[PDB]
Amino acid sequence: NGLTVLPPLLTDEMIAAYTSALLAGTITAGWTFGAGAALQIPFAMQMAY
Amino acid sequence: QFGRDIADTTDAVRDPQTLEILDITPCSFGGVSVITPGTNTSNQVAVL
Ligand SMILES: *[C@@H]1O[C@H](CO)[C@@H](O)[C@H](O)[C@H]1NC(C)=O
């Protein structure tokens, strides 16, 4: 009687979605992440870079 | 005659006449919050 735990604002699914979006953007795009180039740089080119 | 919890708080009790054990649970409670878009715009409020 007097103690309460409050839920966090962002649920687990939202955290997972944020991580998924960030990694997908970093993988699909390359140095063009951020600015909406949205073309798709080949991965081996990024590795060579 | 009765049970106790980890914090040594009563959770059950034998009725004095009918030798049966009744569970005990504290009554539900919680905080209160008020939502406002600002008196600068309106006077509607919603509570949680
Ligand atoms: C808030 O109040 C100021 C004056 O105190 C007024 O100029 C402004 O427009 C108000 N904002 C809104 C969103 O109504």
B1 to B4, B10, B14, B19: CA distances (angstroms):
10, 11, 5, 9
Way the structure was solved: cryo-EM
| Pocket of ligand 1 contains residue B40 by CB under 6 Å | yes
CB neighbours (10 Å) of residue A29? 18
DSSP A23: H
Cβ-Cβ contacts under 8 Å for B4 (sequence gap 6 or more): B10, B11
A14 to A20, A22, A26, A28: CA distances (angstroms):
10, 12, 18, 21
Helix (H, G, I), strand (E, B) or coil at B3: strand
* Spatial distance between the Cα atoms of A43 and A47, rounded to a whole number of angstroms: 6
Helix (H, G, I), strand (E, B) or coil at B14: strand
Inform me whether the C-beta atom of residue B29 falls under 8 Å from chain A C-beta atoms: yes
- Declared resolution, Å: 3.3
* Spatial distance between the Cα atoms of B42 and B37, rounded to a whole number of angstroms: 7
CB contact under 8 A, A1 and B26: yes
Distance B42 CA to ligand 1 centre (A): 11
